[PDB]
Amino acid sequence: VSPGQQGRISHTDLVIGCLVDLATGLMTFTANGKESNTFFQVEPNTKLFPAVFVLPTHQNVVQFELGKQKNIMPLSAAMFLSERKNPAPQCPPRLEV
Amino acid sequence: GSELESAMETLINVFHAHSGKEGDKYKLSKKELKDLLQTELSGFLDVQKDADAVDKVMKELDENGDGEVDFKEYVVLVAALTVACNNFFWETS
Amino acid sequence: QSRGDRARIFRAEKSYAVQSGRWYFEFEAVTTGEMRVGWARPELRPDVELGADDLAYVFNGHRGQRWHLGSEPFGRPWQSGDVVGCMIDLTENTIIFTLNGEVLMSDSGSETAFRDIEIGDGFLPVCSLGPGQVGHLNLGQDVSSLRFFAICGLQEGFEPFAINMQRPVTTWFSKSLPQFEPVPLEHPHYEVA
């Protein structure tokens, strides 16, 4: 959140995209498309669950979007072995909050 | 309630008191009746102040003409008047 | 710590729910602090306090209260070492609580602590031990071990809850280690679409 917008009820929606490169064990985060410095490194064979910690402040709290940017696989492909090479986003019934 | 029961009890108490005050068995002579009246209802009621009223009330109470009053007669009429007074008070005055 | 989680609940296993009969058990309070004991339905929720919901009917000792969907003064507080005998009569749909072999009475003088209970799923022995408290739950697997059963309950025909269970009764407790669970479809506040 920008310091100027800070303290104001923003009329926009914030989008935070969390990227993980499994081969390199690396994680990065992009805010509204702009890369953020915060990066993480993980050991091989680690299991990570997508997560969100929120204090509700409005009727519409948050939304998990399972999208795909250019040349980046969606989450379902990593999550399910059958979809290992499927690039179309999916949210099968097993996936739930 | 039991308070209204006690109200009837108070009526009976006052009645038997003056029924035996002069020894008139259980029935109010003219003298017992007069003394009773100016005792129970001091103010709104008059017997000493209105002796002609006392005599007319002797005749009216004693429609039987006995001159003595048992429980039924005065309970009916005295209760009617003494309660209706406040009903008029609320209505107009 | 959060009070909704502050007290540990120990109950019998669901498979031991009693549908009918007259059952008895004992609960000795090694400490006088906050401790509840009674009968809970099999669908008891770990996070909600005992007797603050319709699921459980219990007696809290430190204050001398009977809890079900709230609190109402009833009985008297126990001292350390006192044994609360809990009785349930499903033929009459009543729950009785006795202290040191004497039947506790509510303010109105009624002997039955709770009345007009629908059998439903059943009922299980349950206790809630606030922080820093110790109790002893005797389910009557060894009938002689009971302290006040003969004095109260035996002649009334009540049964030790585990009189004929050759193996000890299994218990489940309110483990306070947070874990992730699916969002309930009927959660009052949070909806996932």
Binding site: - | - | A150, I151, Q155, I163, N164
Partner: protein, 1123 residues
């Protein structure tokens, strides 16, 4: 004509609709008819018709009345038929549908009627028709559907609007009495079922409406009474009423405001029977609901004040040049702050104001700021400062005050309590100006009340904030520019003083002031009755207020909140909150003042005297003596001591007069008030164990005088004395319980730390009227040992109640209440202080003394059995219940068994008489029927007398008996069971049981801690039955099962014995069922049972006894004014 025809057709169909009871019963014809009607008339069309608007008269055309031609337009009577059809046929069951129709079609109608209620429009034909339509069709429907309003928070604004509209319509004039009654009934029906939090705004209106106490105000009294009575939980409990949240600070403030307004208005107003009778329940209800310790966030010492909207006069005064400089500074600050709001909204400077353009022409520097707008900004400030001057608020410059907005910051600058109050009154003046503007608007419109017309203080905190922003902004700008301002706040003079600000504090202070007024007019009444009798009675208003309101208010409030006044700060007996030491002090002051007021003056109060005495009892119950005695004003201490001393004087004066107009007055006063109130006070002291702290020094001396005078009176003999004996005995027993000095053990008194002699120095208590030696405190009272030896001797003699009337009535209660209290203080008791150095106990009481005593009482009652009248006996039994707890086991064999056995024999004899009478017939039966009735009555009296002791004894020793077999206990079981058999067999016995328990006002459950379950006989049998079951063998239960069947067959006792004898080899088998296995295990584990079941005769007799008990127990558990 066409509307009339269609309305008439719909009305006819609705009338044809079947009745609700037929619909519920499900009559096929009725259901078919209702279906036909529903098909003929669509519901949505009815809703539309109800929605359709009715032209309402207007004051147009130069103030003329434009009233539509009734016969030529759409009229409410037409909608009335629609409503009737909708109710009878379709009915209202869905909350959503109720709200939908209410909002769309009804609520506009009641709004219109309320609006038309004004003077010009009041008598219009359309207005009268609307009143008729509402009161005949709409309001009753809402009253019927009221319960649906529960849980309607989602439409809270609409519900609140409905409540306000209905209340306004109720106030409306020109209504017929029936119409007003219907509207009021709807209002109560809605307020009963609607949630409490909903009532916030309505109650806010009522706070202002009711205090006037006019004729239109009476219905609000009932409404508030009902609402507060229903929701008292929600208002006082810290937790709040279940599922309904908790009250708000503003709501509690409104509650207190309403309470005090009603109190003051009622006190000032002259007497009115109806108004007072309606008020007292209301005042009691709010008093109970309001929390005892609640403290208002804001308090007004000035306590200023249909509505007056005229603003505080400011134009009259002039404005100094100093304040004009401040006006310019605040004008530029306000311009800058408005420009800051504009920058927040993204507005900038422009040529003109346009929402889309987001630019402003006046957003220009203060130098170029136009004069016209400059005057606009300044004039409110001029008015505010002139208002300050008119209020006499004096502002002094300590120092001078210090496009792109540049607003001086106000957040950093704060305001003291004075300045916060000043901001409040400035916002009040601004709101009054606003209300004056609304007043001109409402005058033009012709009526109505703007929702904000209600006083600013009454307005919600958030709503008050709306005007408070500008008020507090001006105050802070004053402060920064250097204006110091002060008017000498009586509020700050009072200071926060939370203890004083507690509601109970003010209530009690007002009560004490009224108490002084009571002393004044009682003195006046006493003087006039003594001489110069006259009927003016100028204080008559105050007298009637006192008696009618204050005394019932005292009773209800101090009964509902007794706990809060008794809970100590260290230990909180009540749910929450504890009274202050000062609050306890005023409680004591009130108690003493009331005792003094009623002293020797009961006859003057007359019919009000019983209520006064009840108030005395309640205040005594709620009194906390220990705290005040430990710390409290010497004046209140002396008041309590003077109450005690005067009580002692009065009771001794009794004593000598009894031994033989003022004397009779003292006699009646003591008989009616002093003795019972003193008894209650002593009982409270004993229950709370306050005796050691409270009864000291002069209090102890007064208590000694009271005790010894009572005892001497008891020794004296007279008929009126024996009349008084019961109350004297109860009072002296309570006094013995309260007494902290072992008066019965002077020889060991020196050990008692809490004694007058030990506390006071030898040089002391000589200036006082104290005997040198404790024995001479009063010699008449015997020592404990001699009392015990005597009572034993008389008991052995077995003399009669008449022979020793004083003993049973006084000495026995005294002694049985004495032993328990001093047992713990004496040896042989749990010594909590054993590890530390323990002084020798002041008393020498031992459990053997109590055991001997109890044996004595048993002997006296057993001797007195069979006498025609022993009314003292029940009192003796209740007084003797406490001792039984510590009775030694051997008492059962020594005294109880023969005692209850004699009664069993008497029961056998009397039932024999009963069967002989039954054989006798006609006049023979009638003669002796009343006889046997009398024997049953006396036997029942003795039976109740004996049991409670036996019950309490059983409770103590049931553990022993059930742990180890007891032949004596088994015999007792047999005996009590036989008594119960006689009870069940004899119907006359049961009716006489009920007659006694009812006539003698016996509280049957109290002894256990009126129904058959409550009946002692069945209670005793149930309490002992476990022993009967225990002494039996588990195997033999099948034999009992068969014996109960035989008893249902009604076989003779010998017949059932022979049945079991011939069926003796039908015993249950352990191998047959497992339960019998652990039954057998426990049975063997208990010792001495190897000799059990040795004889089949034992088996059969045991089974028969138990079966006879169970069968009759089962029978029991499961079965003229008009003339």
């Amino acid at each position: 004509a066409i509307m009339s025809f269609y309305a008439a057709l719909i009305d006819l169909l609705g009338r044809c609709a079947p009745e609700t009871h037929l619909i519920q019963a499900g009559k096929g014809e009725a259901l078919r008819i209702r279906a036909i009607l529903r098909s003929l008339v669509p519901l949505d069309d009815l809703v539309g018709i109800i929605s359709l608007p009715l032209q309402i008269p207007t004051l147009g055309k130069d103030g003329a009345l434009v009233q539509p031609k009734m016969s030529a337009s759409f009229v409410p009577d037409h909608k009335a038929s629609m409503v009737l059809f909708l109710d009878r046929v379709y009915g209202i069951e869905n909350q959503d549908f109720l709200l939908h129709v209410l909002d769309v079609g009804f609520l506009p109608d009641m709004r219109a009627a309320a609006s038309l209620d004004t003077a010009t429009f009041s008598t219009t034909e359309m207005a009268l028709a609307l009143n008729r339509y509402l009161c005949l069709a709409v309001l009753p429907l809402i009253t019927k559907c009221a319960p649906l309003f529960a849980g309607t928070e989602h439409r809270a604004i609409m519900v609140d609007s409905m409540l306000h509209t209905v209340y306004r319509l109720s106030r409306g004039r020109s209504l017929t009495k029936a119409q007003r009654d219907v509207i009021e009934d709807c209002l109560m029906a809605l307020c009963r079922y609607i949630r409490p939090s909903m009532l916030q705004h309505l109650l806010r209106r009522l706070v202002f409406d009711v205090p006037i106490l006019n004729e239109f105000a009476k219905m609000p009294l009932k409404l508030l009474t009902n609402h507060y009575e229903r929701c008292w939980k929600y208002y006082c409990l810290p937790t709040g009423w279940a599922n309904f949240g908790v009250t708000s600070e503003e709501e509690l403030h409104l509650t207190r405001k309403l309470f005090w307004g009603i109190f003051d208005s009622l006190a000032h107003k002259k007497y009115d029977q109806e108004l007072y009778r309606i008020a007292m329940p209301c005042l009691c209800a709010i008093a109970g609901a309001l929390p005892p310790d609640y403290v208002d966030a804001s308090y007004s010492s000035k306590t200023e004040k249909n509505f007056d909207p005229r603003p505080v006069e400011t134009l009259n005064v002039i404005i100094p040049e100093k304040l004009d400089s401040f006006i310019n500074k605040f004008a530029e600050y306000t311009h800058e702050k408005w420009a800051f709001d504009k920058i927040q909204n993204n507005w900038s400077y422009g040529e003109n104001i346009d929402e889309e353009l987001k630019t402003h022409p006046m957003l220009r520097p203060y130098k170029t700021f136009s004069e016209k707008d400059k005057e606009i900004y300044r004039w409110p400030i001029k008015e505010s400062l002139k208002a300050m001057i008119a209020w006499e608020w004096t502002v002094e410059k300590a120092r001078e005050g210090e496009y792109n907005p540049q607003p001086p910051d106000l957040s950093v600058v704060t305001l003291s309590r004075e300045l916060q109050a000043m901001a409040e009154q400035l916002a009040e003046n601004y709101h009054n100006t606003w209300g004056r503007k609304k007043k001109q608007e409402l005058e033009a419109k012709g009526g109505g009340s703007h929702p904000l017309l209600v006083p600013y203080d009454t307005l919600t905190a958030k709503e008050k904030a709306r005007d408070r922003e500008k008020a507090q902004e001006l105050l802070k700008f004053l402060q920064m520019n250097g204006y110091a301002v002060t008017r000498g706040l009586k509020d700050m003079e009072l200071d926060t003083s939370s203890i004083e600000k507690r509601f109970a504090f003010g209530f009690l202070q007002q009560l004490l002031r009224w108490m002084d007024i009571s002393q004044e007019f009682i003195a006046h009444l006493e003087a006039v009755v003594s001489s110069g009798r006259v009927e003016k009675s100028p204080h008559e208003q105050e007298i009637k207020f006192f008696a009618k309101i204050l005394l019932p208010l005292i009773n209800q409030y101090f009964t509902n909140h007794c706990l809060y006044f008794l809970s100590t700060p260290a230990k909180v007996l009540g749910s929450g909150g504890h009274a202050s030491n000062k609050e306890k002090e005023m409680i004591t002051s009130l108690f003493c003042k009331l005792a003094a007021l009623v002293r020797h003056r009961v006859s003057l109060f007359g019919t009000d005297a019983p209520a006064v005495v009840n108030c005395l009892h309640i205040l005594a119950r709620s009194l906390d003596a220990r705290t005040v005695m430990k710390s409290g004003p010497e004046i209140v201490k002396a008041g309590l001591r003077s109450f005690f001393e005067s009580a002692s004087e009065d009771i001794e004066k009794m004593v000598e007069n009894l031994r033989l107009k003022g004397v009779g007055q003292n006699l009646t006063y003591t008989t009616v008030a002093l003795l019972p109130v003193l008894t209650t006070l002593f009982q409270h002291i004993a229950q709370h164990q306050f005796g050691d702290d409270v009864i000291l020094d002069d209090v102890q001396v007064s208590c000694y005088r009271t005790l010894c005078s009572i005892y001497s009176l008891g020794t004296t003999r007279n008929p009126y004395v024996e009349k008084l004996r019961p109350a004297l005995g109860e009072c002296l027993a309570r006094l013995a319980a309260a007494m902290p000095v072992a008066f019965l053990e002077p020889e060991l008194n020196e050990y008692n730390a809490c004694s007058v002699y030990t506390t006071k120095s030898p040089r002391e208590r000589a200036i006082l009227g104290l005997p040198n030696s404790v024995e001479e405190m009063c010699p008449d009272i015997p020592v404990l040992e001699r009392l015990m030896a005597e009572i034993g001797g008389l008991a052995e003699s077995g003399a009669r109640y008449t022979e020793m009337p004083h003993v049973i009535e006084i000495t026995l209660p005294m002694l049985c209440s004495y032993l328990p209290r001093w047992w713990e203080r004496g040896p042989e008791a749990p010594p909590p202080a054993l590890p530390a150095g323990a002084p020798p106990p002041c008393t020498a009481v031992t459990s053997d003394h109590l055991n001997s005593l109890l044996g004595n009482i048993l002997r006296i009652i057993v001797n007195n059995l069979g006498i025609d009248e022993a009314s003292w006996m029940k009192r003796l039994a209740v007084f003797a219940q406490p001792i039984v707890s510590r009775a030694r086991p051997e008492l059962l064999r020594s005294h109880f068994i023969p005692t209850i056995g004699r009664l069993r024999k008497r029961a056998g004899k009397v039932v024999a008489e009963e069967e002989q009478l039954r054989l006798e017939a006609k006049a023979e039966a009638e003669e002796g029927e009343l006889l046997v009735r009398d024997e049953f009555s006396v036997l029942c009296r003795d039976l109740y007398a004996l049991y409670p002791l036996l019950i309490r004894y059983v409770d103590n020793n049931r553990a022993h008996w059930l742990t180890e077999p007891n032949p004596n206990a088994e015999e007792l079981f047999r005996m009590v069971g036989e008594i119960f058999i006689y009870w069940s067999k004899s119907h006359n016995f049961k009716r006489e049981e009920q007659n006694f328990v009812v006539q003698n006002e016996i509280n049957n459950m109290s002894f256990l801690t009126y129904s058959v379950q409550t009946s002692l006989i069945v209670a005793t049998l149930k309490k002992m039955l476990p022993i009967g079951l225990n002494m039996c063998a588990p195997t033999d239960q099948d034999l009992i099962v068969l014996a109960k069947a035989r008893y249902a067959l009604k076989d003779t006792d010998e017949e059932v014995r022979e049945f079991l004898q011939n069926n003796l080899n039908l015993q249950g088998k352990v191998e047959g069922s497992p339960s019998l296995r652990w039954q057998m295990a426990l049975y063997r584990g208990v010792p001495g049972r190897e000799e059990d079941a040795d004889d089949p005769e034992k088996i059969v007799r045991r089974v028969q006894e138990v079966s006879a008990v169970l069968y009759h127990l089962d029978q029991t558990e499961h079965p003229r004014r008009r003339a």
